[PDB]
Design an enzyme around this catalytic site. Structure first.
Site, PDB file in Angstrom:
ATOM      1  N   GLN A  62      -3.741  -1.756  11.588  1.00 21.57           N
ATOM      2  CA  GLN A  62      -3.419  -0.641  12.468  1.00 21.57           C
ATOM      3  C   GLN A  62      -4.524  -0.310  13.470  1.00 21.57           C
ATOM      4  OE1 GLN A  62      -0.120   1.898   9.923  1.00 21.57           O
ATOM      5  NE2 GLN A  62      -2.289   2.563   9.798  1.00 21.57           N
ATOM      6  N   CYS A  94       0.823  -1.208   0.000  1.00 21.96           N
ATOM      7  CA  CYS A  94       0.000   0.000   0.000  1.00 21.96           C
ATOM      8  C   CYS A  94       0.864   1.268   0.000  1.00 21.96           C
ATOM      9  CB  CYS A  94      -1.027  -0.003   1.152  1.00 21.96           C
ATOM     10  SG  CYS A  94      -0.425  -0.525   2.800  1.00 21.96           S
ATOM     11  N   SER A  95       1.443   1.576   1.158  1.00 19.14           N
ATOM     12  CA  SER A  95       2.289   2.755   1.334  1.00 19.14           C
ATOM     13  C   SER A  95       3.305   2.438   2.427  1.00 19.14           C
ATOM     14  CB  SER A  95       1.454   4.011   1.670  1.00 19.14           C
ATOM     15  OG  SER A  95       0.757   3.882   2.900  1.00 19.14           O
ATOM     16  N   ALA A  96       2.811   1.985   3.587  1.00 18.07           N
ATOM     17  CA  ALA A  96       3.646   1.474   4.684  1.00 18.07           C
ATOM     18  C   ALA A  96       3.729  -0.053   4.670  1.00 18.07           C
ATOM     19  CB  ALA A  96       3.133   1.969   6.034  1.00 18.07           C
TER      20      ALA A  96
END
EC number: 3.1.3.48
Length: 281
Positions: free
Chosen positions: A259, A215-217
């Site tokens: 998260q 995704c991004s992280a």
């Protein structure tokens, strides 16, 4: 025993198996699911735990780091570049089967070659991208280090874009399938369709390789997708799902998978939708 061994003990022994009926008809209330999620340790590795010189320029987030027990070590295909470091971990799948997924961060311009190196050495046939990160794939044809990527075909689906890519390394060509999910979510419909797309994807490599998800992280949306996939596999095969056991097994491979508690409760919702969609038969 040390707080680190307390973390490992919880992630190996915690489990809340739920029957297909209990997941659909009487599920744990959001208050209980939130308390359950908060009990799960993040299992984040600190910069002090890694002894890999010159890795910080390779990481998108300084706090989000790959666990050294299961990180992906790069080979030697790159010349103008030393180091085996990539921010990526091997993820166990259904029944703790080894190397079924690779959870990685979104490629930065300096880590694009590292990413294509990983795809080649691990014999990856499928890449799943989760978004609402630099474009690491070409519009027509680009060279990234020793690797040449070319767009062969591209189709637009109402929810995701499918690209058929060819990766070239000297005399050798391999096909890699790329799916870009757009709506990440309001509803779990598009997500189960994405999973069905993954399920219908053939292996195109010489030896079965892991599925790269990012995704991004590489921990939040990446963690939900993988947990959904394994969760669907549990419901189809057994008729029960141990969602708490899935999340805990994810935290052991990569720190911080899933998260928020909202993501945890949505995970129950998605698997509940999937349960209703199973063959009658």
């Amino acid at each position: 025993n040390t707080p680190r061994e307390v973390t490992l003990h919880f992630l190996r022994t915690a489990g809340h198996p739920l029957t297909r009926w209990a997941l659909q008809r009487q599920p744990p209330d959001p208050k209980q699911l939130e308390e359950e999620f908060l009990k799960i340790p993040s299992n984040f590795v600190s910069p002090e735990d890694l002894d890999i010189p010159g890795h910080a320029s390779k990481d998108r987030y300084k706090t989000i780091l790959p666990n050294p027990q299961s990180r992906v070590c790069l080979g030697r295909a790159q010349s103008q570049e030393d180091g085996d470091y990539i921010n990526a971990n091997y993820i166990r799948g259904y029944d703790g089967k080894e190397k079924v997924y690779i959870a990685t961060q979104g490629p930065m311009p300096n880590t694009v070659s590292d990413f294509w190196e990983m795809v080649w050495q691990e014999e990856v046939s499928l890449i799943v991208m989760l978004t609402q990160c630099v474009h690491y794939w070409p519009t027509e044809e680009e060279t990234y280090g020793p690797f040449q990527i070319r767009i062969q075909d591209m189709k637009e689906c109402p929810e995701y874009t499918v690209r058929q890519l060819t990766i070239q390394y000297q005399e050798e060509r391999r096909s890699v399938k790329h799916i870009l999910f757009s709506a990440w979510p309001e509803s779990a419909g598009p997500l189960l369709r994405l999973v069905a797309e993954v399920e219908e994807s053939p292996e195109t490599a010489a030896h079965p390789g892991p599925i790269v998800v990012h995704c991004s992280a590489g921990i939040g949306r990446t963690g939900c997708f993988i947990a959904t996939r394994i969760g669907c596999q549990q419901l189809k095969a057994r008729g029960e799902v141990d969602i708490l056991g899935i999340v805990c097994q994810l935290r052991l491979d990569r720190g911080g998978m899933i998260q928020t508690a909202e993501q945890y409760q949505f995970l129950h919702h998605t698997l509940a939708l999937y349960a209703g969609q199973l063959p009658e038969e």
